Amino acid sequence: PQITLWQRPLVTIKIGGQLKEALLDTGADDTVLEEMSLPGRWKPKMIGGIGGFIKVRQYDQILIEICGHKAIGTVLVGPTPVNIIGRNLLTQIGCTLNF
Amino acid sequence: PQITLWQRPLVTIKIGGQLKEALLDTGADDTVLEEMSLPGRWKPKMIGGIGGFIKVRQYDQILIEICGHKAIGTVLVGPTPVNIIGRNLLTQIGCTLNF
Ligand SMILES: O=C(N[C@@H]1CO[C@H](CO)C1)[C@H](OCc1ccccc1)[C@H](O)[C@@H](O)[C@@H](OCc1ccccc1)C(=O)N[C@H]1c2ccccc2C[C@H]1O
């Protein structure tokens, strides 16, 4: 599909059998979701945004469906303001910017 | 053109007769640039992202050239770690997300 940017590019994602809303963010290097429970062990990571840094939990090889497209990659979990789908997963679904 | 997301989507912009490097960011509502001088009056504003909020100066009706395309819109100036071209200007050049 083709998504315009007059409004936030929010889409529905499926993870852990649950539906959630997330933002397609080309400005994010990684994918970060709001506090939730995921399987396996996690590794520590610090990510810096416009207002500073925050600590997040890194989970690898996580299955996530974005607009029907299945992806399997790294997902970070932490005190993010909104769910963010970053470049690591946008590339998996073949997302590009056009103009 | 079509931009892939394997790497950060950085482009050259021209503002105030100056050439700068900026990130095409669909996750950003507005455009925000690091400290610089712009003509006209401004208004104080607080914007929040990952990490928290930062205080910026809001300028309106600012002209910017992105990849040869002229665009007019609001530009925020403040302690941002990287120059960001947000949705308010991406829409003006006809930028869309596709997959
Ligand atoms: O801060 C953001 N948007 C707000 C909304 O409008 C303000 C600008 O007018 C900025 C974006 O984050 C999503 C969001 C939406 C709505 C409310 C709150 C937050 C913005 O695109 C950031 O995601 C992005 O801002 C652009 C940027 C890029 C590089 C360095 C610093 C900042 C950023 O914080 N990227 C970091 C990130 C995020 C998740 C995982 C890994 C990493 C490493 C870095 O890429």
**3-state SS string for chain B:** CEECCCCCCEEEEEECCEEEEEEECCCCCCEEECCCCCCCCCEEEEEEECCEEEEEEEEEEEEEEECCEEEEEEEEECCCCCCEECHHHHHHHCCEEEC
Q: Compute the distance between CA of residue A62 and CA of residue B50 in angstroms, rounded to an integer.
A: 22
Method for structure elucidation: X-ray
Q: Compute the distance between CA of residue A40 and CA of residue A38 in angstroms, rounded to an integer.
A: 7
Evaluate whether A80 touches B49 at the Cβ level (below 8 Å).
no
Q: Is A16 in the pocket of ligand 1 (CB under 6 A)?
A: no
Q: Compute the distance between CA of residue B21 and CA of residue A31 in angstroms, rounded to an integer.
A: 24
Q: What is the count of structural domains for chain A?
A: 1
Q: Do A96 and B98 touch (CB under 8 A)?
A: yes
Residue type, B25: D
Q: How close A40 gets to chain B, by Cα (Å)? A: 25
CATH number at residue A93: 2.40.70.10
Query: Which resolution, in Å, applies to this structure?
Result: 2.0
Q: Compute the distance between CA of residue A7 and CA of residue B37 in angstroms, rounded to an integer.
A: 29
Measuring CA to CA, how many Å separate B13 from each of A18, A48, B89? 41, 23, 12
* Ligand 1 centroid – CA B86 distance (Å): 10
Residue with tokens 């003006």: B92
Q: In DSSP terms, which residues pair with A56 in a beta bridge?
A: A45
* Ligand 1 centroid – CA B50 distance (Å): 6
First-to-last C-alpha distance (Å) of chain A:
15
Evaluate whether A48 touches B30 at the Cβ level (below 8 Å).
no
With a CB cutoff of 8 Å and minimum separation 6, the contacts of A4 are B91, B96
Q: Is A30 in the pocket of ligand 1 (CB under 6 A)?
A: yes
Q: Could you tell me the residue range of the domain that residue A16 belongs to?
A: 1-99
Evaluate whether A24 touches A85 at the Cβ level (below 8 Å).
yes
- Select from B17, B5, B14, B27 the least CA-distant residue to B67: B14
